Amino acid sequence: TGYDLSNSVFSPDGRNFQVEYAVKAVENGTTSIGIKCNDGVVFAVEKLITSKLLVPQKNVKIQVVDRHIGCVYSGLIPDGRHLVNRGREEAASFKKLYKTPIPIPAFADRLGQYVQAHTLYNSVRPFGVSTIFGGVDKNGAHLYMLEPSGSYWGYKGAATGKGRQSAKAELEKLVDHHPEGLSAREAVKQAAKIIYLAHEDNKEKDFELEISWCSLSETNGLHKFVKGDLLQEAIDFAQK
Amino acid sequence: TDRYSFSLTTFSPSGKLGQIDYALTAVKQGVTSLGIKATNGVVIATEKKSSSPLAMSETLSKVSLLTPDIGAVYSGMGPDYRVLVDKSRKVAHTSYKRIYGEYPPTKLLVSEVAKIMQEATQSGGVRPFGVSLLIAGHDEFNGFSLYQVDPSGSYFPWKATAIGKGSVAAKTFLEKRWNDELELEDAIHIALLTLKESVEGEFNGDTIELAIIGDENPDLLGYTGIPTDGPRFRKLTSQEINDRL
Amino acid sequence: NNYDGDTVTFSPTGRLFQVEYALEAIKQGSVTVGLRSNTHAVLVALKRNADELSSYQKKIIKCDEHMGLSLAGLAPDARVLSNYLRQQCNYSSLVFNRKLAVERAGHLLCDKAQKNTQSYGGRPYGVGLLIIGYDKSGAHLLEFQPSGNVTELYGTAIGARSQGAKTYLERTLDTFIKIDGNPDELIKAGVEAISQSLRDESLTVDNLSIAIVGKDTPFTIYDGEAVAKYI
Amino acid sequence: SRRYDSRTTIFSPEGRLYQVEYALESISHAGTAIGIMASDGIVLAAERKSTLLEQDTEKLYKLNDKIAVAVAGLTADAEILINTARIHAQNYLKTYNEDIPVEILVRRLSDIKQGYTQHGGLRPFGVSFIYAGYDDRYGYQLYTSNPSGNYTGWKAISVGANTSAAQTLLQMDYKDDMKVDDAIELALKTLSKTTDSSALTYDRLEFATIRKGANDGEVYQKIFKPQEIKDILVKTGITK
Amino acid sequence: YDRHITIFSPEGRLYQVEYAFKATNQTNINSLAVRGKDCTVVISQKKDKLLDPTTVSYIFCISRTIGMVVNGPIPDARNAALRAKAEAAEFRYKYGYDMPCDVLAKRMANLSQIYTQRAYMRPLGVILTFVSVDEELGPSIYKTDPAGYYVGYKATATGPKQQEITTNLENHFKKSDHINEWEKVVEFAITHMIDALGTEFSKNDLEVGVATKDKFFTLSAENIEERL
Amino acid sequence: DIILGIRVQDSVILASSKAVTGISVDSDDKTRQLSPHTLMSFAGEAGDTVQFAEYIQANIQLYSIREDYELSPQAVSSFVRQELAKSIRSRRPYQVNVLIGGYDKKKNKPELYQIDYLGTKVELPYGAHGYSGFYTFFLLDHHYRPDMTTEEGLDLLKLCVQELEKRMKGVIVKIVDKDGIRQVDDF
Amino acid sequence: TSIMAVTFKDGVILGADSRTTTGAYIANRVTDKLTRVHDKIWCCRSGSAADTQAIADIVQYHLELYTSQYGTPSTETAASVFKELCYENKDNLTAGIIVAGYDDKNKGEVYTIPLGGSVHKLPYAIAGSGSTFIYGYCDKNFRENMSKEETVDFIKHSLSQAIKWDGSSGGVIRMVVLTAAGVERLIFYPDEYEQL
Amino acid sequence: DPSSINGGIVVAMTGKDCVAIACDLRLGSQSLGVSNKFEKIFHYGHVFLGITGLATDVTTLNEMFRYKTNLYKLKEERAIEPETFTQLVSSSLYERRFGPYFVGPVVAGINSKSGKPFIAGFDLIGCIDEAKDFIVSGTASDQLFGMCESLYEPNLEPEDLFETISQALLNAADRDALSGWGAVVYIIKKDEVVKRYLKMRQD
Amino acid sequence: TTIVGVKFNNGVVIAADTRSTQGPIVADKNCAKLHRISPKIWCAGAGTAADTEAVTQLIGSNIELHSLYTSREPRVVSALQMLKQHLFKYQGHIGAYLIVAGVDPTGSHLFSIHAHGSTDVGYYLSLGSGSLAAMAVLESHWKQDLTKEEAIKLASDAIQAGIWNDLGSGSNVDVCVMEIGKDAEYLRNYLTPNVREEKQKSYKFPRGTTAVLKESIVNI
């Protein structure tokens, strides 16, 4: 009843309704997916072409933290940019203190603490984005997903946004059919296919596909966009 | 972020501070504790209730040494009492001992605790403490003393008193057995008899806490050499309570 | 509606109503059009006046020698954002001897707008902006909304009845895309586009303002007789 | 946190301060205090509100060697204000090497009270004070101050549960040429007549006098012990 | 109202604290802690093919000797874990010896009490169980709740199905404190949980934390299977 | 800098040099009437003296307005001493020495106080600041009597001023008594 | 003070003397200049005793927090934490530190932080007042992939010469060996190393 | 040296059941005598304090200690004893560890409950010196030490203690250029205090 | 001043002299230089007397509060750390040179602390202006295993050497012994080898020799 009008107010059943409303805001965004391969991570996202006047290949969504972390999000894009700026500040501080690129689980914990801190007071609003991020460190490849409540987990494959159900089903089938794992390029192709399949829920507007990856044997442990012939091959595979 | 710069305790149209009354209700729902003043000591007593049968009740003590000659007990909310005891010890050290080299008298320390409790009923964005305190002490120039401090910061000196669920019955019993000539042993016996009425479960040394402000204890003073150097406050072990039962 | 009191409250469906009210404030402003080619970028603005004895409200603000914008909505918010953009461009020039990119300025405006929709005690801005510039990557046009969303487009229009101008721009995209080296033709295309949003008024030298930036052209504003040849 | 603010420092449509009036109503339910000034001294008499427990070691307080106060209301707020007043008197003595006039201290306390009424978001002090003092300017002085920040000077005054009846009694039987003993008798008679109890015993009273002499110098403050109160009650005629 | 912030109800209650207690049971996971007179053992009941199982855990290593188990939502759990790690490190720096379990529990309980008394702070909907082998007290289990209340235990259980485990533990102790046996204590706790709840806990259904004299560690799934 | 003061049975007489220190042609007055029955004379570093004297005068006038009452000379001297003692510990201490003359109406007696820049207050029958004492104290010690009248005090002050002029122009002479503060014109 | 650290085939070895002086008076015959900051990360301290002790305490605290949050820190990370304190407070502190660590991947590593607050990674490092007298000998005798016995002998000879020529160094020779097998302590008395 | 600008000396001795505290009266700037009526001894109830050093610091400390003793009496409802006042003086002095008062305070009194005379001295930063025989302070401290180590006896009646302390003070002040323009002695018993002004050579 | 600390088989003993001077003039012939941080933790301080006393008092108050908070007996290392950090914060401007000894649940401990914050651990330590003679005695006679009686004798001998040979040290000897299972034993004036001989005469003046100008009664 009256327990939904302020943040950080427990309901009689032990719920925070503002965070659930933020999840509702997240559910209205576009579909963002992440796949963990044998030696890296692949991030894919769909961008709606609302008007033909939008300049193609501009308005980049996927963002980079340090030189090895990739981040994508679904929900209110400015909130995602705020979170990415905070993550860049955290990574810079860690690098300055300890002279080593920040490990992915440590970065995930710092982001989670920052998101959680916005559910503790009624003078602030929870973040309305769900974030899929990851990369490569000395321990290997890591993929994480973070929710508006501040809870995060590590995933074999993650999906968020309006077309999350079909994307999750496709990711589960992909994981089941490849127990050994997947290569980076095969992961890029599968991400293209899954984004195209998940777009079939929203056929009212056209979309553009954006793909990035961070792999040890393909990018030497750095985060790089897919723009060349590989992007066209992935698009052709998805449309096939 | 913190915008609670305004008082949460305000006067009702009838002239009553609702939050302090509600804190008093919370105190009145608490377990019984008692204090009795004798000619050569003071006794402070309380019941020890366990949240779980698997909990080691010895790790939780409802009677706390404030100074070597001053101790305290409470009825109400436990964590509030714990924080208040920490603050009281710190104020005793930083307000009196670091200035005069001596521990404060009982009355001044009670006044400091009362100031702390009052500040929680007028400062912004703070809930008043939901405890009532009984403080027993001894000082050179005033003798033995017993005080009661309320959630509003009001404190009163008592020859004997009780707080908690069985407050009225215990107060009547103590009124009927006051003669201005009791000794410490008589006061301990009276306290045990009064507690036996207000305890519904087992009544032994593991469910009662007793403390005394009596005579100096050179055994509880881990050094020798200074003739002027005693910790009057003493907590009775469960074995002694069982023996007295 | 109990969820529209402040900017830190979500609705049960996940909507921020103060942001939507600021967008509504934008939708009641005078129409402005932005357009660009591979060599030049142009802004066309229709001014408004209180009455005949009044002057017309300025709608185009210069940010730097290579960058400017036009506003639709609450003018003081446009002044605040324009001052911030001027400071950022000046900082880039002073510290790096570098001309600030248009995309980075859009990012800065997005970040500044986002902070006003998440904390108590502050309202979102009440203006939409069209930003044109020329940098090492060529000509750029951006659209900024007070929700923080910034988009890069070939052309657009904002304000009241801007849909007709937007449809005209969408239809004639391939034409004005290739107007390179002929600034007057691009300006005339923009004027024709903004003519689609007029209902009961005609363009005059008092209510029409134009701005242009380009490869060899610093950001310049034409008003009054300077636009008489474009009517 | 705007919802939870009660706005303790705002006017009413009639131009009244609700918190000040409510604090006055709160004070109207406290033990009665009476101050009477004669030609050669001042008498303060307060009625406790009682059990058969410790009394010799709550309503009468000492500010300096020449000024005392009687309290009606919350005791802890009164103690706060009394500590501030004692510090102020000592500061005045340190600065000017003279004893502070009564009116200056009273006005300082009244200003402190008024500040809580005008600015800030905190509740006012629910305390009324009766000041009895001596200075070289006017001699013996009696004042009262309420939560509204107003202070007044009185020949005879009462504050508390039965102010109306006590004031009506004091309007008669008071003369400008009375003595200290006559003032003591009048205060005791008024307390006995206004008391809502079976008898006016010594264990429910506090007494104080300020006069000249009595094994002292210019001015002596005497705070009556329970035995002295009993003797005075026997002498006057109450015999309770 | 009085049911939205931490102020007294007319009955002297604090509704937000009670609601945080309710929130502590959002995850349907039970945990059990026992002592073995030379070690302390805690066992939790971790319950999607897309998740990475190794990243799911409610058992934290606060320091070299102190371990923690949390009942409640994972964000508040990680908040409390970070706070406890910082407090233990500060204690060791300031006083020159390792922080004991009971003092850390008291400090966390004081923070919880501060939350229950200050309006702008909300309580954390978690229950914290600290285990160690103190150099002065031997095996130690202490528990703190959203109300600011903490106590030590001979053994303890947390979760929705905690009454059955508590009753079974009390019956075992009445038969007869502590467990007179770390691996044996771990197997005892596993069997106790199996008897209390039912079914057969596989290596993926539980997580085990063991505190010995100079260490606290967590067993892998292979070690848990070795226990089975 | 000549600052001198003599307290006689019913009054206080202060003398201050009417000289400055350049090139100009004026008749400087180094005294401020703190109250109708309290006067202060000052000497020391230029700038600091006038500022300090005006600050003290403003505070005393404010107190007099607030209480509708005149502070006694003792209270004024104590306040000035407190101000100087605070100043000596500050970042920029005042380098000012003062003589305070007054006529206590309650006690109906004249009072003279001498305070230095450190904050040392002394009540004296006669006092001086600077080098006036070194050349005046022999005469003051030989000739002073506590029961002297106003004319006798003026004659003694005239002898002191002549002695000062021997080892050097003119002085300003102020009288504080029951009728208040006045300036001597025949001197 | 004469401190050094030498990398060898199986790990690293730190060595130091034990003399503390207040001018001409030996205020402590038996000083431990080898301070542990983590289970297999140690340091040799030279300069102001108070400054080096405070820095080592702060570094140990920071590394404990790092271990609780992120895992086992590397030797380079510990050297960086030392470097931050030395460089940012170089106008108030006098500290020359040799950080020596072991890990499974990098084996043994040595970093030197001289006055000023710069960090240099070296196969071996030497510091202190008595180091100047052994710059040649060590440069003439250091090899790589030496066995444990050879490294012990090298450190013993070098420190014996440094003690012999430097009046501010002396006492016993303390050594700490960091290898995969763990941490080992060694001590050598004057009657042993003075016959060399 | 600020402590040697104004001059002055204070002595204190213990009797059988009595105490004595004496001071000089001179106040001078550098070498010119300003006042011969500057007393360095004050009392707060039955506790006596004598301060040597800067005259401004003497007055300031007297006012501050009067403030603190009045507040102590108001809160405690009893006068402060010499033993507690000594700790109060030490703490007040150490609170200015780096901007210290240039003072030489000496405390003398009789404990009301015990009746035992008490005496103590302080440096400028509050170090306490407890003595059973005597305490000296001022510019003529060495002369006072020489007089006291020779004239003092462990148990003296107040009549003899007066002569002893007076002779020590006078003979130490006659060898100090900055001390001596008059002299005051206080003889303090349980129920009586006597103040005497001595005759002196002046110059 | 001379201050020493010596360990033995089941505890630790500290010792000090009792002379405090201001230059060449003796200000206090019997001064206490053994300070009680806690009932079984004692510190002996040289350098600035006021600094030593104030710092020991502050650290003792904090240690007592910490012991109440933790419900445990104080440890020597805690006092060492707190003293060390407080002294290092002031960069040597607090002139306290301490020997801190004690017994705690972990055993017996002896440490030395300098005014800049450096600390040392040793079986035998000396500090003060007479520390050289005391250290000469300690190096001459200290043994690895000592009984309580031998340790007391050795510490007293070192303090006596400082008394005899150092001008800034003298008068009496104060000792404090702390044993693992016993109470702390504080021996004030354990040895008093400097007792002034009787004077050649008595200088008691006859009554009436001092001239008096005025007399009055003071009301207290």
One-letter amino acid at B155 equals Y
Is there an interface between A and H (3+ Cβ pairs < 8 A)?
Answer: no
CA distance A236 to B103: 85
CATH of the domain at A198: 3.60.20.10
One-letter amino acid at D118 equals Q
Residue G57 touches chain E, beta carbons under 8 Å: yes
CA distance B54 to E165: 11
Nearest CB to I61 within list B65, B97, B221 = B97
CA distance D7 to D120: 9
Q: Which residues have CB under 8 Å from B64's CB, separation 6+?
A: B71, B72, B73, B85
Residue B204 touches chain E, beta carbons under 8 Å: no
- What is the three-class DSSP state of I215? strand
Long-range contacts of E54-59 (CB under 8 A, 24+ apart): E54/A154, E55/A105, E55/A144, E55/A153, E55/A154, E56/A153, E57/E207, E57/E218, E58/E27, E58/E29, E58/E31, E58/E207, E59/E207, E59/E209, E59/E218
CA distance H105 to C218: 81
Structure token pair of residue C230: 């474009």
Task: Enumerate the H helices of A12-76 as residue ranges.
Answer: 17-27
- Other CB atoms within 10 Å distance of the CB of residue E222: 8
Burial category of C127 from C-beta neighbours within 10 Å (exposed 0-12, middle 13-18, buried 19 and up):
buried
Read off the DSSP letter of residue G76. H
Task: Enumerate the H helices of chain F as residue ranges.
Answer: 48-67, 73-88, 132-143, 150-166
Angstrom CA distances, G70 to D163, G63, H102, stand at 71, 10, 56
Mark yes or no for CB contact I116/G50 under 8 Å. yes
Among G172, G174, G170, G168, which residue's Cα sits nearest to residue G186?
Answer: G174
Among I186, I166, I164, which residue's Cα sits nearest to residue I176?
Answer: I186
Residue B199 has phi, psi (to 5 degrees) of -105, 125
Mark yes or no for CB contact E23/A10 under 8 Å. yes
- What is the three-class DSSP state of B9? coil
Residues 53-72 of H with CB under 8 A from D: 63-64, 66-67, 70-71
Q: How many CA atoms lie within 13 A of H104 on its CB side?
A: 25
CA distance C59 to C47: 7
- DSSP per-residue letters across E63-122: SSS-EEEEES-HHHHHHHHHHHHHHHHHHHHHHSSPPPHHHHHHHHHHHHHHHHHBSSSP
Mark yes or no for CB contact E92/G61 under 8 Å. yes
Cross-strand bridge partners of residue G184: G177
Residue A109 has phi, psi (to 5 degrees) of -65, -40
Closest-CA residue of F relative to H32 is F134
Residue B181 touches chain A, beta carbons under 8 Å: no
Mark yes or no for CB contact D94/H70 under 8 Å. no
CA distance D102 to C29: 67
Instruction: Give the angle subtended at the CA of F155 by the CAs of F153 and F156, to the nearest 5°.
Output: 65
Structure token pair of residue H78: 């009893």
Structural domain that includes position A53? 1-240
Q: State how far Cα A163 lies from the chain centre.
A: 14
Mark yes or no for CB contact G48/I120 under 8 Å. no
CATH topology of domain G1-196: Glutamine Phosphoribosylpyrophosphate, subunit 1, domain 1 (3.60.20)
Closest-CA residue of I relative to B100 is I57
| Chain A residues touching residue E21 (CB < 8 angstroms) | 14
Nearest CB to A14 within list E26, E56, E122 = E26
CA distance A237 to A230: 10
CA distance G58 to C117: 41
What would the 3-class secondary structure string for chain H be?
Answer: CHHHCCCCEEEEEECCCCEEEEEECCEECCCCEEECCCCCEEEECCEEEECCECHHHHHHHHHHHHHHHHHHHHHHCCCCCHHHHHHHHHHHHHCCCCCCCCECCEEEEECCCCCCEEEEEECCCCCEEECCCEEEEECCHHHHHHHHHHHCCCCCCHHHHHHHHHHHHHHHHCCCCCCCCCEEEEEECCCCEEEEEECCCCC
Q: Which residues have CB under 8 Å from D156's CB, separation 6+?
A: D34, D35, D36, D37, D142, D170, D174, D186
- What is the three-class DSSP state of G158? helix
CB A41 within 8 A of CB A35: yes
CB B47 within 8 A of CB B104: no
The resolution in Å comes to 2.0
- What is the three-class DSSP state of C122? coil
Residue C118 has phi, psi (to 5 degrees) of -130, -10
Mark yes or no for CB contact A10/E26 under 8 Å. no
CA distance D12 to D3: 19
Mark yes or no for CB contact B100/H76 under 8 Å. no
Q: Which chains touch F (3 or more CB pairs under 8 A)?
A: D, H
Residue among B60, B67, B90, B223 with most chain I CBs within 10 A, to mutate: B223
Helix orientation angle between B167-175 and B184-198, rounded to the nearest 10 degrees: 150
CATH of domain D1-239: 3.60.20.10
CB I52 within 8 A of CB I96: yes
Sign of CA dihedral F2, F3, F8, F10: positive
Tokens 């074995």 found at: B239
| Chain I residues touching residue B90 (CB < 8 angstroms) | 65
Residue C32 has phi, psi (to 5 degrees) of -135, 145
- Other CB atoms within 10 Å distance of the CB of residue E155: 25
CA distance F17 to D191: 68
Sign of CA dihedral D196, D201, D203, D208: positive
Chain H: give the shortest CA distance to residue D162, in Å.
Answer: 31
Chain H: give the shortest CA distance to residue D219, in Å.
Answer: 17
Read off the DSSP letter of residue A147. -
Residue B1 touches chain A, beta carbons under 8 Å: yes
Mark yes or no for CB contact A97/G81 under 8 Å. yes
Read off the DSSP letter of residue E8. -
- What is the three-class DSSP state of E60? strand
Domain count, chain H: 1
Closest-CA residue of D relative to E2 is D4
Pairing of strands B160-163, B208-213: unpaired
Q: How many CA atoms lie within 13 A of C92 on its CB side?
A: 16
CA distance H56 to F82: 10
Q: Which domains does chain C have, with CATH numbers?
A: 1-231 (3.60.20.10)
Q: Which domains does chain B have, with CATH numbers?
A: 1-245 (3.60.20.10)
Q: Is D211 left (phi over 0), alpha (psi -120 to 50) or beta?
A: beta
Chain E: give the shortest CA distance to residue I72, in Å.
Answer: 9
CA distance B90 to B110: 13
- What is the three-class DSSP state of A2? helix
Residue among E93, E95, E98 with most chain G CBs within 10 A, to mutate: E93
Given strand B233-235, what is the order of strands in its sheet?
A: B160-163, B33-37, B42-47, B208-213, B233-235
Structure token pair of residue F42: 């000052």
Given strand I184-191, what is the order of strands in its sheet?
A: B223-224, I184-191, I173-179, I11-17, I3-8, I124-127
CATH of the domain at H107: 3.60.20.10
Sign of CA dihedral G11, G17, G23, G28: positive
Residue B44 has phi, psi (to 5 degrees) of -125, 130
Domain ranges of chain I: 1-220
Among H108, H105, H107, which residue's Cα sits nearest to residue H96?
Answer: H105
CA distance B164 to B198: 10
What would the 3-class secondary structure string for chain D be?
Answer: CCCCCCCCCCECCCCCEHHHHHHHHHHCCCCCEEEEEECCEEEEEEECCCCCCCCCCCCEEECCCCEEEEEEECHHHHHHHHHHHHHHHHHHHHHHCCCCCHHHHHHHHHHHHHHHHHCCCCCCCCEEEEEEEEECCCEEEEEEECCCCCEEECCEEEECCCHHHHHHHHHCCCCCCCCHHHHHHHHHHHHHHHCCCCCCCHHHEEEEEEECCCCCCCCEEEECCHHHHHHHHHHHCCCC
CB pairs under 8 A between D and E: 4
Angstrom CA distances, I30 to I14, I21, I195, stand at 17, 11, 12
Q: Class assignment of domain I1-220?
A: alpha beta
CA distance G42 to G46: 14
Q: How many CA atoms lie within 13 A of G142 on its CB side?
A: 18
Residue G137 has phi, psi (to 5 degrees) of -50, -50
CA distance D38 to B218: 57
Q: How many residues are present in chain C?
A: 231
| Chain D residues touching residue F82 (CB < 8 angstroms) | 94-95
CA distance A91 to A100: 10
CA distance A30 to F105: 91
Structure token pair of residue F163: 């002695």
Read off the DSSP letter of residue C3. S
Q: Report, at the CATH architecture level, how domain E1-228 is classified.
A: 4-Layer Sandwich (3.60)
| Chain D residues touching residue B159 (CB < 8 angstroms) | 52-54
Q: Which residues have CB under 8 Å from G91's CB, separation 6+?
A: none
- DSSP per-residue letters across B159-223: SEEEESTTHHHHHHHHHTT--S---HHHHHHHHHHHHHHH--S--STTSEEEEEE-S--GGGSSE
Angstrom CA distances, G80 to A68, A99, G63, G91, I129, stand at 21, 6, 11, 18, 42
Span between the terminal Cα atoms of chain F, in Å:
19
Angstrom CA distances, H103 to D77, H2, H9, H186, stand at 40, 9, 11, 20
CB E102 within 8 A of CB E137: yes
Nearest CB to D86 within list H63, H64, H71 = H71
Mark yes or no for CB contact A98/G69 under 8 Å. no
Domain ranges of chain D: 1-239
Residue B79 has phi, psi (to 5 degrees) of -60, -35
Sign of CA dihedral E187, E191, E197, E201: positive
- What is the three-class DSSP state of C51? coil
| Chain C residues touching residue A53 (CB < 8 angstroms) | 153-156, 166, 169-170, 173
Burial category of B202 from C-beta neighbours within 10 Å (exposed 0-12, middle 13-18, buried 19 and up):
exposed
Is there an interface between I and B (3+ Cβ pairs < 8 A)?
Answer: yes
Mark yes or no for CB contact A98/G77 under 8 Å. yes
Nearest CB to I81 within list E95, E102, E136 = E95
CA distance C18 to C39: 39
Q: Which residues of D61-83 are buried (b: 16+ CB within 10 A; e: fewer)?
A: bbbbbbbbbbbbbbbbbbbbbbb
Span between the terminal Cα atoms of chain I, in Å:
41
- Other CB atoms within 10 Å distance of the CB of residue D164: 11
Burial category of H150 from C-beta neighbours within 10 Å (exposed 0-12, middle 13-18, buried 19 and up):
exposed
Structure token pair of residue E220: 């892998």
- DSSP per-residue letters across B121-160: TTSBTBPPP-EEEEEEEEETTTEEEEEEE-TTS-EEE-SE
One-letter amino acid at A73 equals Y
Instruction: Give the angle subtended at the CA of D63 by the CAs of D61 and D64, to the nearest 5°.
Output: 130
CB A76 within 8 A of CB A223: no
Tokens 């240690």 found at: I63
CB I23 within 8 A of CB I168: no
CA distance F41 to F26: 18
CB I138 within 8 A of CB I113: no
CB B209 within 8 A of CB B240: no
CB H51 within 8 A of CB H104: yes
Angstrom CA distances, A138 to A36, G109, H64, stand at 16, 18, 67
Structure token pair of residue B23: 């804190």
CA distance G11 to B91: 54
Residue I42 has phi, psi (to 5 degrees) of -125, 145
CA distance E20 to A9: 10
Nearest CB to F119 within list H32, H56, H99 = H56
- DSSP per-residue letters across B50-90: -S-TTB-GGG--S-EEEETTEEEEEEE-HHHHHHHHHHHHH
Mark yes or no for CB contact D93/H67 under 8 Å. yes
CB I156 within 8 A of CB I175: yes
Cross-strand bridge partners of residue F103: F110
Residues 106-125 of A with CB under 8 A from D: 122-123
Angstrom CA distances, E43 to B61, E26, E156, E210, stand at 29, 18, 11, 9
Q: Which chains touch E (3 or more CB pairs under 8 A)?
A: A, B, D, G, I
- DSSP per-residue letters across F31-84: EEEEETTEEEEEEESTTHHHHHHHHHHHHHHHHHHHHTSPPPHHHHHHHHHHHH
Residue D146 touches chain H, beta carbons under 8 Å: no
Helix orientation angle between C102-114 and A77-98, rounded to the nearest 10 degrees: 100
CA distance E124 to E6: 13
Domain ranges of chain E: 1-228
One-letter amino acid at C73 equals G
CA distance E2 to A9: 12
- Other CB atoms within 10 Å distance of the CB of residue C21: 13
Active site residues of I: 1
CA distance I191 to I175: 9
Q: State how far Cα E122 lies from the chain centre.
A: 21
Domain ranges of chain G: 1-196
Structural domain that includes position H176? 1-203
Among A170, A171, A115, which residue's Cα sits nearest to residue A146?
Answer: A115
